[PDB]
Amino acid sequence: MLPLYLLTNAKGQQMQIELKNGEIIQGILTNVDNWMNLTLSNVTEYSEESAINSEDNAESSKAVKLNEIYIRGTFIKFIKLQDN
Amino acid sequence: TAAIVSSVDRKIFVLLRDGRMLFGVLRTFDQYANLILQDCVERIYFSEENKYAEEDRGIFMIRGENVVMLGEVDIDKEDQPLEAMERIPFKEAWLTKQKNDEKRFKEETHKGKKMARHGIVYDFHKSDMY
Amino acid sequence: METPLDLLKLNLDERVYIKLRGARTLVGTLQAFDSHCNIVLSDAVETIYQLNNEELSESERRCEMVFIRGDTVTLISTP
Amino acid sequence: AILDLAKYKDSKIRVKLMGGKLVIGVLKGYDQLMNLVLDDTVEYMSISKNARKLGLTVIRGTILVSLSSAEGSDV
Amino acid sequence: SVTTEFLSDIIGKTVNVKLASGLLYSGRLESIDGFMNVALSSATEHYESNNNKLLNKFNSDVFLRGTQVMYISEQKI
Amino acid sequence: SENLYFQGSGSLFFSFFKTLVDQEVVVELKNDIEIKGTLQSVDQFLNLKLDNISCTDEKKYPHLGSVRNIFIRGSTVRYVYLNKNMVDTNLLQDATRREVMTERK
Amino acid sequence: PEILPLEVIDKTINQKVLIVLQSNREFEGTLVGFDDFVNVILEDAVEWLIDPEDESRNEKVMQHHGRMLLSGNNIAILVPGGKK
């Protein structure tokens, strides 16, 4: 429950979540539960493949925007937290 | 079911299930091997061509089931082999690495399909790219 | 009734045949197991099935004492 | 709980599932374990040519990996 | 408890047990537990269908992991 | 009658490995990498901490000379090779029967 | 009233149902019953392997007779009324 606890302090903050399949979800954490399920707002979704390819700009920025998303904790691989 | 939350500070490498190597500072972990890393770096090696690549990743929270192995490292010592190596851009290296992963996966689905025709199941996990 | 665990302990100290994920099979002498199917085998003989160019082939390794992680186990029987 | 499904009632939702499948349909109802009732369900398998209509269906909360509105914006 | 009652009255009967891998086992069900671990007597092994090539015939009980079981069914044929 | 490989209901392999601490083992992973080392620790999930390691190097992965001790995720292990010398197989068979006594519940 | 997933499945007992797995496999049959974990009892089930590209190149693996217990381990989707 270490991850659940730290995240509940990160509510309101932006983050980059990568899923087990390589999908990246960047958004504002609005809620977390005991099993580490997440709801984010202001979300933009893309792949690691697309984020890496847009490094020296090619085929710029193929992404998708969502108002809200629910993510299953057990499907999370890792979470990049804001530098602060 | 108490959480044993260890506060530490070590320089480590982490190998993930997807095959990536991270270097960073481990600050926190629990008994499930959930980790909080500081000043992370993703590093890719191709010793077969004397080339490597780095890119900064910052603060990483990693879920423990995605870990293969980790271990304390001496950063300065691991630099030295790099000094004799040619650093390439991360995008180029990542693309090379994705090319190699693709090859493995297609060889493994091919093996699974052939062995099935002989009745053998090659139970195979798409997630195990390490 | 005899549960499947009860029946399996009848094979303790006997030669068993184990099938693993990844086209591999073992034969050895069953020393231990739990409800998760972790297993200790003695005098084991592993057999790896491979494809030489769309042809079925096999090779083998042998070892004294071996722990086997349960999540790889697909079946247990006798040699 | 964490996601109030009531706000999504009677609209089209997008739901990813563990083994690669995506399902889109109108949310008719749901439970605490996030089992869902979807109507006019379309199931995509692992692109677009791969679409099956299933109509009224029940998705298991257990294999759900993400849920969002079917409404969204490209680039 | 329709599921446990179903399991209760097939103990001892011949069944088909299909794994997630698609391997199919037929024989007599000696035991089954709450996690659907299975022991079977006189077991044959086929891939996908009983009508396919016999891969293995087993002469003692075969034990199968409940975590891998896709289905268990009555054999009538 | 007390078996060191049996400390209570759910801990057979946990008690088994604590017995192998300070012994040289070889851990083989699902990806085929083999790692020789000295067992320094084990936990209830059978994650392994090996001291003083040596690895079979790979084309994929760099040799990292400064690494002396690694944590290994239990779910990534395929085999742990040992010596017959390291285990009392009488106690192991006995412990298993004690576990089977419990696990049937 | 509210519509409840478990209630829908109940109203399907003695009806045809299509059970879709996480993998590409489905079973059509008469629903006899199910439990809390949604283990399902089916009668005289048809087993299909399904081609992602062509619903025409689907493959009937077997016509089952009697009852089967299908573990809710792998159950993704229940479609009341079956394949239609």
Side-chain angles (χ1 to χ4, degrees), chain A residues 2-3 6-22 24-33 35-55 58 63-81, chain B residues 2-48 50-76 78-112 114-126 128-130, chain C residues 1-13 15-48 51 54 57 59 61 63-79, chain D residues 1-2 4-6 8-45 51-75, chain E residues 2-52 54-56 58-59 61-76, chain F residues 2-53 55 57-83 86-104, chain G residues 1-15 17-50 52-54 56 58-82:
Chain A
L2 161 65
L6 183 55
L7 290 181
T8 321
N9 305 328
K11 289 175 83 119
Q13 290 249 348
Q14 72 192 323
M15 54 194 49
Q16 226 151 352
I17 301 165
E18 180 165 341
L19 301 182
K20 260 84 164 289
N21 58 3
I24 296 174
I25 280 77
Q26 175 193 340
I28 296 288
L29 193 294
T30 69
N31 213 20
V32 198
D33 70 29
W35 305 271
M36 212 196 311
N37 305 325
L38 311 165
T39 63
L40 306 102
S41 71
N42 301 96
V43 359
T44 297
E45 146 191 333
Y46 49 98
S47 71
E48 186 167 303
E49 165 154 67
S50 73
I52 252 81
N53 265 323
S54 72
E55 249 159 51
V64 160
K65 300 184 92 65
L66 291 171
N67 187 290
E68 186 187 21
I69 202 175
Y70 174 90
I71 293 177
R72 190 53 68 68
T74 68
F75 196 53
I76 294 153
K77 182 200 312 196
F78 62 66
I79 301 186
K80 191 185 180 315
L81 288 316
Chain B
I4 309 181
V5 197
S6 307
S7 312
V8 297
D9 155 65
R10 313 270 188 114
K11 330 288 204 172
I12 60 156
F13 88 100
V14 177
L15 170 57
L16 293 193
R17 188 174 276 280
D18 68 24
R20 91 183 63 209
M21 296 207 48
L22 297 180
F23 289 81
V25 183
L26 181 68
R27 303 303 314 280
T28 323
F29 61 92
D30 61 19
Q31 69 267 55
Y32 307 94
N34 297 315
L35 329 165
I36 295 155
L37 297 188
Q38 222 181 40
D39 300 306
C40 283
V41 146
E42 184 161 334
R43 197 173 299 179
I44 305 191
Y45 294 72
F46 300 107
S47 56
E48 196 66 32
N50 212 53
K51 307 178 190 175
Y52 82 101
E54 270 203 15
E55 172 158 284
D56 283 50
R57 295 267 172 280
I59 311 173
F60 259 31
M61 183 187 302
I62 308 178
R63 279 187 46 105
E65 63 283 18
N66 306 280
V67 177
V68 174
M69 46 156 110
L70 58 77
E72 194 170 48
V73 95
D74 175 286
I75 296 300
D76 279 9
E78 301 301 334
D79 279 328
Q80 293 177 335
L82 295 174
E83 291 164 0
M85 291 179 70
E86 175 200 10
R87 177 169 192 185
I88 69 178
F90 190 83
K91 171 166 167 283
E92 180 186 355
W94 188 98
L95 276 172
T96 300
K97 177 182 187 294
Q98 174 193 58
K99 184 187 289 299
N100 300 327
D101 290 348
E102 163 257 313
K103 273 215 179 63
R104 178 162 51 226
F105 180 84
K106 293 307 183 69
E107 290 168 335
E108 301 299 84
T109 67
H110 284 333
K111 181 183 286 298
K114 274 306 174 321
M115 282 186 174
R117 314 290 179 93
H118 299 68
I120 288 185
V121 297
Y122 191 73
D123 226 344
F124 170 80
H125 293 289
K126 315 162 166 44
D128 301 348
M129 272 287 129
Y130 69 98
Chain C
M1 81 163 313
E2 307 269 325
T3 63
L5 287 178
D6 295 321
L7 292 188
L8 185 54
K9 82 183 180 192
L10 265 67
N11 276 286
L12 273 176
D13 211 56
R15 291 307 262 190
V16 295
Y17 174 90
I18 301 182
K19 227 205 285 201
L20 308 171
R21 302 179 131 116
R24 300 166 97 99
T25 69
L26 272 140
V27 180
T29 302
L30 179 64
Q31 309 294 333
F33 63 86
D34 58 18
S35 74
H36 298 131
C37 215
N38 299 311
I39 273 151
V40 174
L41 281 185
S42 68
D43 290 345
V45 168
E46 186 191 35
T47 292
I48 304 176
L51 261 233
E54 199 210 328
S57 42
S59 40
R61 305 189 273 163
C63 56
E64 265 179 302
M65 193 63 84
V66 61
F67 166 87
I68 293 169
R69 204 191 156 85
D71 57 43
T72 76
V73 175
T74 67
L75 102 41
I76 312 165
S77 206
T78 40
Chain D
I2 180 182
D4 170 45
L5 292 179
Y8 287 82
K9 293 179 179 179
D10 306 321
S11 42
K12 259 176 177 179
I13 57 176
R14 189 174 158 107
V15 180
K16 253 105 171 177
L17 311 183
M18 270 172 66
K21 293 211 256 298
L22 179 62
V23 153
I24 292 169
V26 179
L27 179 63
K28 308 264 44 192
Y30 49 90
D31 62 9
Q32 59 288 342
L33 307 180
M34 287 187 77
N35 299 309
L36 321 172
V37 187
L38 296 191
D39 200 19
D40 282 291
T41 307
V42 183
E43 161 201 9
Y44 299 82
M45 299 162 55
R52 327 165 58 211
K53 288 161 271 189
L54 300 174
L56 191 280
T57 66
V58 167
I59 311 300
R60 293 295 309 313
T62 39
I63 40 90
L64 199 150
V65 287
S66 71
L67 193 141
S68 67
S69 174
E71 297 188 344
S73 311
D74 290 286
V75 172
Chain E
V2 179
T3 273
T4 58
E5 300 163 13
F6 175 81
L7 294 188
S8 262
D9 37 41
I10 59 157
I11 293 290
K13 263 90 165 203
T14 35
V15 290
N16 308 295
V17 185
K18 193 148 183 180
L19 291 199
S21 71
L23 289 179
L24 177 73
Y25 300 86
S26 290
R28 192 171 300 273
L29 180 59
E30 295 302 320
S31 185
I32 187 176
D33 64 34
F35 303 133
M36 291 191 229
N37 302 300
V38 162
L40 307 163
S41 65
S42 284
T44 51
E45 171 171 81
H46 303 78
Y47 182 71
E48 300 279 358
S49 196
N50 265 354
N51 290 282
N52 284 121
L54 191 285
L55 304 175
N56 288 296
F58 296 94
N59 277 292
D61 288 14
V62 316
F63 299 90
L64 299 184
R65 287 281 281 166
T67 54
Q68 297 163 28
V69 167
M70 160 171 101
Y71 72 67
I72 298 175
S73 68
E74 307 180 313
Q75 167 88 304
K76 283 148 166 32
Chain F
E2 296 305 279
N3 192 326
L4 53 106
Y5 294 152
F6 184 84
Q7 294 177 268
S9 304
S11 290
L12 196 170
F13 288 77
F14 186 26
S15 303
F16 170 61
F17 282 103
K18 281 201 290 305
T19 261
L20 298 176
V21 163
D22 294 323
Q23 298 297 315
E24 170 189 12
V25 299
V26 175
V27 183
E28 173 170 321
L29 303 164
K30 297 201 185 40
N31 81 320
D32 277 2
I33 299 166
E34 299 185 43
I35 299 158
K36 186 188 310 161
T38 293
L39 188 69
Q40 183 225 112
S41 166
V42 60
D43 58 12
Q44 66 181 113
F45 322 97
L46 316 178
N47 300 316
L48 312 165
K49 295 189 63 189
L50 293 178
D51 259 45
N52 301 321
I53 63 167
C55 280
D57 208 31
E58 192 115 302
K59 281 174 178 172
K60 185 172 187 186
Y61 295 128
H63 182 258
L64 297 170
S66 70
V67 172
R68 294 316 167 189
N69 318 317
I70 54 173
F71 163 81
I72 302 187
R73 176 80 180 179
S75 73
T76 76
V77 178
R78 174 194 287 136
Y79 296 134
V80 177
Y81 301 102
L82 332 139
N83 286 344
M86 295 171 192
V87 51
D88 193 318
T89 55
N90 308 136
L91 250 53
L92 250 197
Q93 289 171 37
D94 177 67
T96 308
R97 301 185 174 97
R98 280 184 156 91
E99 208 234 358
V100 178
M101 261 285 174
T102 63
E103 300 305 314
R104 61 181 301 286
Chain G
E2 193 187 358
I3 301 167
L4 291 190
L6 292 176
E7 291 193 341
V8 168
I9 298 177
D10 182 41
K11 292 190 167 71
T12 310
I13 291 177
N14 308 317
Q15 303 312 314
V17 75
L18 181 72
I19 302 294
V20 191
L21 305 197
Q22 297 144 193
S23 59
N24 299 316
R25 201 191 287 276
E26 44 201 39
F27 296 77
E28 182 182 46
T30 301
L31 173 65
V32 175
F34 67 97
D35 59 12
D36 280 332
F37 327 92
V38 200
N39 296 307
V40 154
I41 306 293
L42 290 190
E43 215 178 271
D44 306 309
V46 182
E47 180 175 356
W48 292 96
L49 269 188
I50 168 176
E53 297 85 13
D54 37 353
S56 176
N58 282 354
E59 167 168 324
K60 181 193 303 207
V61 180
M62 220 189 75
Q63 170 65 86
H64 294 82
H65 311 276
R67 294 175 169 190
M68 70 158 54
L69 175 72
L70 177 63
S71 100
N73 243 62
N74 308 291
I75 294 169
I77 307 182
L78 307 89
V79 188

